[model samples]
Target chain A: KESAAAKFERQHMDSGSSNYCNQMMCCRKMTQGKCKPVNTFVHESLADVKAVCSQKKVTCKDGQTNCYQSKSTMRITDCRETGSSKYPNCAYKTTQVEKHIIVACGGKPSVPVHFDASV
Target chain B: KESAAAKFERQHMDSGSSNYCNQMMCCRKMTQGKCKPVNTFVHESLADVKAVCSQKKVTCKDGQTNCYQSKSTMRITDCRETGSSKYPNCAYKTTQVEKHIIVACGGKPSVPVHFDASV
Candidate 1:
């Protein structure tokens, strides 16, 4: 069937907005510089994507953010301080990421990638 | 602590890109016009969000889509057919959602909203 990484990428890709994106990103950033994978099965429209973003308590100086994990790497940073006019509001601290792999889970496909806020 | 709804939203509030958004939205529409909530944790950047959407198997006349859920509603539709123009590529079978409660898990919140492929 499908790989976990493939599944992770499938769920959180830029498909719009929702509740999952809000907490995952925030919990990861607000506290630590790292986070775990995601585990969810959301239904409904992507409105909550923006709704959560808009409602969530995203701070600048001392705020946290979270995001889904793919392959390779997941780099968490505070882009808010960066005065990049390109993504002013968005630069509200974005993360940097690449593709790789921490664990392959092999053929068994045991766990579903856990997210954490401990970097 | 936060409720499951709070948590689900935290994970996907339009923070950016990743893996989850892709499957949740598509699976919701393509198969059943509905979907389940999401799960799993991630640790990485949001780049894969766009990547997933760009790399997803979204069909127009005969395709599928999915998305996350919020507190009230989740509206799944083929916005591609509608001439919104405001959201050309986005209108690609877009979903219309409003929020409502299906079940209120008390004290020991048990679910994170399971998405489905049903209308």
Candidate 2:
């Protein structure tokens, strides 16, 4: 199984650019057969995201441990498929937002693996 | 921005065991602060998961390209927070289900990086 931490890195981590999603969404295969209507990419380094674990502990939606809330807002980009999009012809609208991200961390490497959600 | 594919792996991928959720949910930090009410984990190798892209292409919910479906039913584990669960005291129930997974692939690496959903 792909580690949750690795998953977060793959989906959310990206260069800060208007073309980030345009190129990444396709290069990353997010545009293979159909477009991912909405997705987020984190612009911070992996280590920075992991460090959130120690920043603050909050009750997760499931009421469990190992989840953390970022102390400060992080840079992120959202990719949304355009209304007129078609398969093999996917297009995206990029929007940047800054928000505190919530993540689930664990494993021997002890890094942020799962992005629970963002707020 | 954690990759959606990676996010799926974290929440869904797991070993096939009664203790899968119990161990992973905590070890992965999905249980930190609060338990995640429901989550899924794929139990296949990364290569196998990535191969789903070639298995079949489907119309993603967003009606775009770059989504793929698994040809065969993949092994997976689901973790659900138990009804009696409480914060800092999360408990989970493990379930096994076979289903086709949807994913988005891309990047220079051109591997799966987001989990769209399962059906």
Candidate 3:
């Protein structure tokens, strides 16, 4: 019953902990007792992320042109499936990094509603 | 907005001839007035596909167990992106084939809800 904007925030926004992915990934329902192979989280403020919608445009991986590349770099984290991961006991390893990000934007007033890549 | 069942019918039901896919793909709005990578059209009567809901269970590619497999093969056409394909100018090539189909069903009154696979 969550809205797309809210879901993008839940899955890609700054909400985090050392046990961040562990608790958030499960509660956010990304796991079905099986690990989601890869997921990335961006640490920029929502308004900043939202501003990327008005920044510039680039083609999306899916052949869409509404995607944009932020002129600046942002702190982000990549979550990887740990070798020990298994159903009902999904685990992840996190690598924190900073890089330019490309995001898909859409909606009334236009906003970054999807993470495209860290380029 | 239309119901999922209606959308499924619009995208999957009987497509009859050679150039059928070209206009139907657009006439049906399956591509947002743009190119849809791939789509399959079932040539059998809707009744047979609908009866598939009562067929036995099989796993869905998405890993759900509610999908049902048809006991008999049905005629079908596979619509794929041709080299000339371009979004906003969606073009396709239809290839005829026959295969036993797998469908996922769920909704009030229990009718065929989705085409899951062909085997």
Candidate 4:
């Protein structure tokens, strides 16, 4: 995630040759709070999945304690090319963060991880 | 994209306290280049989709002009709750960007719009 140069090689960069990376060039900005759809991905290519893991955490709701503390295991998975115009012929990875229902937050949204070679 | 306060309401703020917003609180950074997934979205809540459109841009490849220029329409889609961990429920937006991708840049990547009442 820190070193762009160390992550991709010339062959690896042009390997996908799909729409995912191309559109990103003209993408308004990478930090728009939104991420592209994930079709396929190389599980190991991601740094966070390899470096980070689920840590035990607690949650309180409505000023209540012991509101069900849980552990989530975040990992990068699925790398395949499906038929799609947005990212046709390219790969995408889904960063799966397994956690419990924090009714206080927003149900329990799976922290999806959309990865890009340039990002 | 700029005004965070102008977008969401007090009632809407805590409307869906799923795991999405909760993890983000512990998220490393919003600008990590990667983004969380989105399941449901209020199509009109987005600014870019309301403002930007297909402008018919030109592209040349390998010293060749008119490599079959195409047009693409981007939009926000689907807002629902799914069963998962990272972001179990809540909402997510998919920005479909269509065009005769320029392989040089690494195909065309869809620019996803994750409208967190925050970003």
* lDDT (Cα, tens digit) per residue for candidate 3, span B6-116: 767877885344545664565456556568778877979988888888987899989988799999989987788888988755677878789998988888867767778
Interface RMSD, candidates in the order listed: 9.4, 14.6, 18.7, 11.2
| Clash total of candidate 2 | 58
TM-score of chain A, all candidates: 0.21, 0.75, 0.82, 0.17
Residue B106 lDDT, candidate 3, scale 0-100: 81
Best model per lDDT: 3
Evaluate fnat for each of the predicted models and list the values in order: 0.00, 0.00, 0.00, 0.00
Output the lDDT of residue A59, model 2: 63
- Prediction RMSDs, each to the true structure: 19.1, 18.3, 18.0, 19.2
TM-scores for every candidate against the unseen true structure: 0.21, 0.43, 0.47, 0.19
TM-score ranking of the models: 3, 2, 1, 4
lDDT tens readout by residue for model 1, B14-101 = 3322333333333223213323233222222233222222232322222323332222222222112324323212222334333321
lDDT of 3 by residue, A7-84 (tens): 777678852234445544554456664678777788888877877887878999889888998888888887777888
lDDT of 2: 0.72
Give stretches of model 4 more than 4 Å off: A1-22, A26-119, B5-35, B39-75, B78-119
Off by over 4 Å in 3: A1-119, B15-17
Full candidate order by lDDT, most accurate first? 3, 2, 1, 4
lDDT of residue B14 for candidate 2: 45
lDDT of 4 at B97: 24
Model 3 chain A poorest 10 in a row by lDDT: A15-24
The number of clashing residue pairs in model 4 is 43
